[PDB]
């Protein structure tokens with residue numbers, strides 16, 4: 207049965223991990239997959255997380271199955287984070303949340319739900335894209351089409367080209383937006399641009415799907431949700447696939463949520479029934495540990511205070527590395543102004559390197575970035591900055 | 603977009619949970635979903651598990667993403683459990699294991715892998731069936747057909763009808779077998795019958811898929827894998843979807859594995875590449891905590907000894923409840939010989955109750971069983987036995 211199966215290429219970001227592991231060169235530097243590293247170049251468990259895990263060790267009395275949609279308190283805390291305490295969406299019971307295995311799991315659940323239960327045939331994503339969107343949506347039988355997004359010459363959001371390319375989207379198409387820290391460009395709509403897109407989306411009949419994996423990493427928890435909230439104020443329906451992987455540094459525990467919004471409580475509950483069916487046909491119920499940690503932290507004032515400071519600390523260290531990167535590139539003799547890197551939000555710099563420059567970086571220098579030219583600024587430290595900048599300058 | 607979505611019925615086992623929760627009657631008894639309860643009627647975390655969790659709290663230094671196939675040691679320990687230390691399958695590197703979110707996740711991964719990469723169009727399951735097999739395989743676009751299995755009059759495996767009904771399966775069809783503790787009948791092939799089916803399967807060109815969620819609950823860890831091992835000795839290819847939910851009482855941490863077997867190392871590695879692609883398009887990488895616990899216990903002699911005794915203890919308590927159930931039914935005045943219940947393996951008794959008898963049990967008596975007549979013997983205690991048996995006798 208398996209004799210004639212075609213070989214495939216690996217996940218083009220997660221697959222960097224294996225390459226990096228096999229590399230026996232001592233000075234190798236990982237700027238690939240977007241995980242946060244501290245000053246020492248490691249990716250620690252947050253202190254708030256360790257404290258919550260100690261609590262769970264001492265107080266959990268069962269591993270009995272969670273409901274298909276996971277921990278009720280986790281859903282409640284998620285909706286508050288997404289929409290704001292006192293949101294009309296919450297008051298009017300228009301939102302239902304399933305805890306999922308990561309935002310990736312939430313994306314697949316959304317895709318299966320839409321494919322089976324609606325007339326959706328196409329999802330629009332930005333170019334440049336995040337590779338796994340195509341993989342997930344195609345797996346559920348949905349076409350993926352790309353809209354224009356990034357003006358590579360001014361290093362801004364090309365709002366005109368964005369709007370014009372989306373004129374091709376039909377009513378009933380899905381349009382995927384990154385909530386904040388657009389991956390890979392790090393360029394987000396202004397609040398005013400979010401409000402314009404919200405209005406356009408309503409007029410054009412698009413279904414908004416928010417991929418929201420970086421809440422807290424652009425400006426702050428509440429600020430980063432402004433765009434989503436602008437859409438929520440304007441739409442009857444939308445979906446959010448959110449993640450706690452990055453903002454809790456809980457990557458491997460697979461902690462995310464798929465939140466369904468409809469016009470009213472009757473409609474969302476009936477629709478959510480089919481979302482639960484899409485889960486039943488997949489992994490049945492979500493993993494407790496990571497979601498329990500999140501719910502524990504979010505519902506306890508003291509832990510929440512510690513966690514929010516840790517998140518601020520991560521964002522601030524990345525901002526320091528961002529400035530140091532640009533300074534060091536200059537000092538190392540770069541043949542380009544890299545000032546545009548400062549404008550970018552989140553963990554990355556979308557640096558303008560070509561695919562061949564990134565291949566050479568890996569081959570000759572043991573510096574690992576994504577083929578798109580995306581580099582993980584959150585993986586830079588004072589100790590690895592000089593070598594990595596020397597490498598980049600050498601390939602320009 | 604969501605206005606016209608059709609309502610659906612809940613997962614017909616997991617959905618019992620909600621019903622049971624809403625029931626405000628004090629004497630309610632849950633004999634539905636197959637989770638183990640101890641003498642006190644609760645479902646404890648195993649001591650071996652708590653010890654492993656303490657170890658992880660004290661010693662984990664990161665939550666960085668696992669590879670798409672999960673923890674390497676977890677795969678190694680899984681293959682040893684499945685095939686035996688020193689198996690030619692392991693020596694010849696013919697097996698590849700992905701850690702998944704439960705056996706349910708492993709079933710979906712297998713289904714997606716097969717649907718996308720092979721000519722498989724149909725999966726054969728037993729009647730009576732486990733409801734979620736149909737849901738999972740249908741979700742990937744595969745037809746599910748049923749083979750005969752249980753002789754309800756002799757309470758044995760109807761081996762003749764099994765073999766005759768499978769004559770309809772074509773070469774290239776998948777045939778799903780439960781490794782041990784067939785759900786819901788509790789009746790398994792003898793070793794000799796396993797060997798006969800292994801031979802038949804090779805002759806007929808079926809792809810064997812083992813659903814192996816109860817290793818340790820029929821007779822013992824090694825004994826329960828005899829049937830799988832009989833198939834592994836005879837086949838070039840097969841798939842195992844295994845679970846640690848029950849044998850580690852780790853239900854909500856979603857700990858399972860999808861193991862792919864091919865003729866040789868080159869074929870399985872190429873095929874496994876596409877299995878990883880099916881994972882990438884789904885939840886991306888598996889949850890660390892529960893799999894870390896399993897790997898920790900399985901690789902440490904002291905913890906492994908404690909865990910294997912805890913598993914023995916669970917099996918033995920269920921066997922005691924099984925005998926007490928039958929005795930109490932007799933004493934309470936049952937109008938049937940229920941001796942056949944003693945022959946059944948695993949957590950359940952497939953009791954012969956009709957769908958209306960189970961509905962009446964829930965409605966009138968607050969005793970919750972599955973609509974098929976399946977009752978969770980592992981949920982019975984000395985304290986709830988009298989009421990539940992009084993209820994059953996009342997509905998006969």
Ligand SMILES: O=C(O)CCc1ccccc1
Pocket residue numbers: 219220238239240241310336338389886
């Ligand atoms: O590097 C990233 O783009 C974020 C981390 C990640 C990568 C691929 C799948 C899930 C998460």
Ligand SMILES: O=C(O)CCc1ccccc1
Pocket residue numbers: 490615616634635636637706732734785
């Ligand atoms: O009750 C069972 O049959 C086993 C527990 C279970 C039920 C449904 C999905 C996954 C596991």
